[PDB]
Amino acid sequence: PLLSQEDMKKHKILLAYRDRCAALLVPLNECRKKNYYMPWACGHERHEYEMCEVADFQRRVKAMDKLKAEK
Amino acid sequence: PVPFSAANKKLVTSMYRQSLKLARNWISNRQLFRQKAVEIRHKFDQNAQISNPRLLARTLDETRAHLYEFRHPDPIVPPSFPGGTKYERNVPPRMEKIMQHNLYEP
Amino acid sequence: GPELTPAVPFFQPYVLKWAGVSLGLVAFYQFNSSYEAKNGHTWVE
Amino acid sequence: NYKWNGPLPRPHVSAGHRIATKFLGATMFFWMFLRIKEEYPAMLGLHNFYPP
Amino acid sequence: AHVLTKDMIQERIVALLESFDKVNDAKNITATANLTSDLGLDSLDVVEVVMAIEEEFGLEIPDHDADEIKTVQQAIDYVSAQPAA
Amino acid sequence: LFHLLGHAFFKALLFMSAGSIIHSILNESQDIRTYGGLLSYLPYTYICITIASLSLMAMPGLTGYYTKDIIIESTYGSYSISNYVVYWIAYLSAVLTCVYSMKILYLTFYSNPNNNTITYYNAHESNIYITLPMFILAIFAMFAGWILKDIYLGVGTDFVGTHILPNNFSYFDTEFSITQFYKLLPLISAILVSILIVVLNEFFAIVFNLNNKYINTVYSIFNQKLVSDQILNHFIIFKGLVTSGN
Amino acid sequence: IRASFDKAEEPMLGDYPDIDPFPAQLKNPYKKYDDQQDRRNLEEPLSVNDDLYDMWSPDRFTHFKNQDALKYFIGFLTIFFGASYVATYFVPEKAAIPREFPYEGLWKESGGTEKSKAFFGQRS
Amino acid sequence: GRYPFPKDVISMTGGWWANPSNWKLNGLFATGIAVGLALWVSTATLPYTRRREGITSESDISKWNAAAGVWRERHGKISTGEA
Amino acid sequence: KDPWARREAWRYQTNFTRANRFKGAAPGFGIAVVAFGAYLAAEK
Amino acid sequence: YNAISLIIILPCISWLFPLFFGRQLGYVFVTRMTSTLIIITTLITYYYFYQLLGNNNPINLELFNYLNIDYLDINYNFEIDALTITMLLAITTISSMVHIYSIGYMETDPHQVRFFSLLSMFTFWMIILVTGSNYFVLFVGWEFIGVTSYLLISFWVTRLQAM
Numbered sequence A: 001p002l003l004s005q006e007d008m009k010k011h012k013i014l015l016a017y018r019d020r021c022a023a024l025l026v027p028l029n030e031c032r033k034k035n036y037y038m039p040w041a042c043g044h045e046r047h048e049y050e051m052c053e054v055a056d057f058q059r060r061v062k063a064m065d066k067l068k069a070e071k
Numbered sequence B: 001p002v003p004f005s006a007a008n009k010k011l012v013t014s015m016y017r018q019s020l021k022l023a024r025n026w027i028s029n030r031q032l033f034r035q036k037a038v039e040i041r042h043k044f045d046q047n048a049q050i051s052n053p054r055l056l057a058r059t060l061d062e063t064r065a066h067l068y069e070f071r072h073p074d075p076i077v078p079p080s081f082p083g084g085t086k087y088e089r090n091v092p093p094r095m096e097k098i099m100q101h102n103l104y105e106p
Numbered sequence C: 001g002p003e004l005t006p007a008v009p010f011f012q013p014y015v016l017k018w019a020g021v022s023l024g025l026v027a028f029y030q031f032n033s034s035y036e037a038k039n040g041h042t043w044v045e
Numbered sequence D: 001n002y003k004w005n006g007p008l009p010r011p012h013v014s015a016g017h018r019i020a021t022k023f024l025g026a027t028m029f030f031w032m033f034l035r036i037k038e039e040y041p042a043m044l045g046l047h048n049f050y051p052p
Numbered sequence E: 001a002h003v004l005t006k007d008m009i010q011e012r013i014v015a016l017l018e019s020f021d022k023v024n025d026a027k028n029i030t031a032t033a034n035l036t037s038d039l040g041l042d043s044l045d046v047v048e049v050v051m052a053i054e055e056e057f058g059l060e061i062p063d064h065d066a067d068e069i070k071t072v073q074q075a076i077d078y079v080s081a082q083p084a085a
Numbered sequence F: 001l002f003h004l005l006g007h008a009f010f011k012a013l014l015f016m017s018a019g020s021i022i023h024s025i026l027n028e029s030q031d032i033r034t035y036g037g038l039l040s041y042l043p044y045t046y047i048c049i050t051i052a053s054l055s056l057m058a059m060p061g062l063t064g065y066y067t068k069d070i071i072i073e074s075t076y077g078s079y080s081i082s083n084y085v086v087y088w089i090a091y092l093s094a095v096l097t098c099v100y101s102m103k104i105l106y107l108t109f110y111s112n113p114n115n116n117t118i119t120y121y122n123a124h125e126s127n128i129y130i131t132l133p134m135f136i137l138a139i140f141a142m143f144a145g146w147i148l149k150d151i152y153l154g155v156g157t158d159f160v161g162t163h164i165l166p167n168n169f170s171y172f173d174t175e176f177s178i179t180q181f182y183k184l185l186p187l188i189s190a191i192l193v194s195i196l197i198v199v200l201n202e203f204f205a206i207v208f209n210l211n212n213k214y215i216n217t218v219y220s221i222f223n224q225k226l227v228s229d230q231i232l233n234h235f236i237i238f239k240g241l242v243t244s245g246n
Numbered sequence G: 001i002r003a004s005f006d007k008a009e010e011p012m013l014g015d016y017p018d019i020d021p022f023p024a025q026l027k028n029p030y031k032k033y034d035d036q037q038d039r040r041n042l043e044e045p046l047s048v049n050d051d052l053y054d055m056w057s058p059d060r061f062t063h064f065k066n067q068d069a070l071k072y073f074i075g076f077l078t079i080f081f082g083a084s085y086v087a088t089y090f091v092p093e094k095a096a097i098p099r100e101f102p103y104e105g106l107w108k109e110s111g112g113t114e115k116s117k118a119f120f121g122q123r124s
Numbered sequence H: 001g002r003y004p005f006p007k008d009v010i011s012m013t014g015g016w017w018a019n020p021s022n023w024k025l026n027g028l029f030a031t032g033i034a035v036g037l038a039l040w041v042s043t044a045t046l047p048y049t050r051r052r053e054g055i056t057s058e059s060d061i062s063k064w065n066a067a068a069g070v071w072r073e074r075h076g077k078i079s080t081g082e083a
Numbered sequence I: 001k002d003p004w005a006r007r008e009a010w011r012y013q014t015n016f017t018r019a020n021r022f023k024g025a026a027p028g029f030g031i032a033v034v035a036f037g038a039y040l041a042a043e044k
Numbered sequence J: 001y002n003a004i005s006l007i008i009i010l011p012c013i014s015w016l017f018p019l020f021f022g023r024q025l026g027y028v029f030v031t032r033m034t035s036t037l038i039i040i041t042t043l044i045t046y047y048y049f050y051q052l053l054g055n056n057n058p059i060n061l062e063l064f065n066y067l068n069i070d071y072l073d074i075n076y077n078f079e080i081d082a083l084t085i086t087m088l089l090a091i092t093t094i095s096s097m098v099h100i101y102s103i104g105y106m107e108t109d110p111h112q113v114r115f116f117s118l119l120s121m122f123t124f125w126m127i128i129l130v131t132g133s134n135y136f137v138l139f140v141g142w143e144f145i146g147v148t149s150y151l152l153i154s155f156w157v158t159r160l161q162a163m
């Protein structure tokens, strides 16, 4: 679910990261804070946010496909 | 312009030295440098016996032009010499006594 | 082991002069601040 | 420097330096192998994110 | 570090000349031998020799001085006179 | 920032290993054409300089990879259409880099000796004070990039708090939009060109040691700092001194 | 004598030697000199513009002529810039539309106001 | 290796290969002064240290922004681009 | 043809043969293949 | 124990103490001491980086005022944040390594006290550069590193090309 403006401010998400699933950004950043940003940890949360961004970019490439098709 | 004189000697020996230094500078590979050196040797050998003034003068001029065409941007120079990277590095001080300049103050 | 040049005392006249002056100035500053805290005005004022 | 214009002897190098060389080379090669194995799909470029 | 001795210079130069091919003979190479006369080296061959000597000891000979050395003694003393050799 | 941090380590290692190589020579020469083959004589310095070079060429699984490759890819992934030229420019620069790294490596350790015999007799490694820091910087230049990639290049990382305009931010696009050709081409070219340079040096030296006048001219241009130093010293500095005299 | 600025000074000398100046850097360094570092012997006459020709003077390079080096410099810059500019034309188009953000491009969060949403605000 | 050098030349850096015969005792003095200075300053500058966030409360921040709005309304103040 | 061919021999002899000149160019690689095989076995 | 204070001040000591006392200490002790101070600085920086990864709440150090005329209020203010700590990682690691390396590389040279003092000086002024919290302190470090670069590149003063 898209985060509340209040929630998104309260977690102090960066402006460029504030998207339709900053919701998964929040737990990922919390995990990354508990561990010391170590590469081996936070695997599940990291993958979860990446899979968001997959869906996200996918809707984008389809939107550009539609725009291309109009021309 | 003598076909065989001491000055001719000095000139051509200097030019031949030069040619060799140029060849060493240009060629990285040792074997290849060796073949270049032997070719340069043969080329000097062939024109060694020129006698008449015009032909000798023309050949010397042309070889000077050749050497100028094949001069290297940066020759190899050992570190301790003028072009070198050690040159004047930690030059030992001249040992000297202090001359005074003032009667009252050292 | 490298060679060994002649001994030299640690505290030279210039070390003494500059260190003494600087440390005295800092001590004087602290004394004035404390004397302010107690007397309500700095000893220099 | 006993021999001149002649074949050179095998260089003498300290035990410590050979051991350091073996350790550094082993570590670099092993680390590189481990990294390629662990990241093969992403580093080589696989699983295209575009829709089929 | 590393320091050379006159005899070391002479030994290196003797070996250098020994391996040169256009020499007349190897045994005839003396300390005071003249390359032009005794060993019968050409105008250019002594030039090749001085280039070999500078390449061996890692120095650089000016033109005016290279042509000045005519005997092996001159060469050894010249190479011993240069500090960075 | 991440490339700056990663580059510092292996660059310092390059310089230190170079210092060791220079110190190994009696002449203390720095010319690459006078080193010859030192691989047998200086194996530890060879391995240190090799690690440093491979990190620099962004070989897979090394620190320079996680910096250089992703910077190359961000140009293609950039939203501005015009940056695709910058992609090919930077790519050329990378393979260019592999070229001179291999040239130095080969001409220092892999080529036939070019220095006189006494140097090779006396060629030896350096002391402990020189060796230990190279060892430490080697472990850094192998491990730091991997251990730190999350901190600076993370999907959602908030460590560096710079406020990127959402319009400009494209780090997702550069990863999702990249194709196999563009994501593999720098690595494959780097490995090939390295091997090509080595084999050409060891087997066909003529192609490098030609004698063409035009190629010698262009090489001379490139050798003198791209003849820029000439331009400065004559047209700016000297003309200004002349004007000062006026 | 050789250079224009030295020629300019010829009327301004009276009874001073008109010296031909030679860059002291180009004097070959194997001759002996009283001061080896400056490659000068004692009581050598000085050109009027000496300070431009001593060792401390800016370095001069002999490989290319100055004009020729200028040609090369400008040529490299022109070919590089022009090749890049022309390459801008032959460019592939991307595949994914640029990303967008909620709330009309978060124009609230980058400051902004209802009366001015064009200055601050993303692609929405 | 080494070479002769004038002994009269006194430099505060020590000159040529300076290695005084009592260098270990002067070294003890130097390290004592070093620890003294470092510790003194580390303690002295302690009060002037603080964290970046958490210093003030949201109450202060919000009330200050509200006061700023009050000021900008007392005067005639439109926003940037508000036109 | 070379009159210094005796001077240059050592540059191509034992320590500077192609086989020896490229020996030791991949230090520890054998230990690395052993270790990688072992880790492949242990990881499963 | 204050990480930021020690970070700014240990390199300052490693710079100035050789200059003040080099004739009294000699290059043996000067080399060892400057190296050790830089090592301690590096370790402190690593510890700080570790904690910052734990908690991104940068430390600030605010000192006396440089300038308070008209509207301009310039202070000697220092902070260490993510950017600064990255730079400090690079700086302290490489400075410590180079200080160790110079013990061996420079063992023959007569003037080692001045050399090591200059290396430490450059480290100190770079730390000042990256730690300052306003453009003025940045400029102070920015120019002093140039001064030290001049003093280092011309270290072999007798060499004309060097100068």
Ligand SMILES: CCCCCCCCCCCC(=O)OC[C@H](COP(=O)(O)OCC[N+](C)(C)C)OC(=O)CCCCCCCCCCC
Pocket: H041, H044, H045, H048, J012, J062, J063, J064, J065
């Ligand atoms: C070697 C570098 C050490 C630097 C830090 C160590 C000092 C320990 C105390 C920390 C406080 C501090 O530094 O200021 C020192 C003092 C105290 O000022 P403050 O009010 O407490 O600071 C304000 C902090 N606020 C903002 C939180 C309130 O200021 C001054 O007198 C200013 C005068 C400048 C010095 C006079 C010149 C003499 C120098 C001679 C030049 C060669």
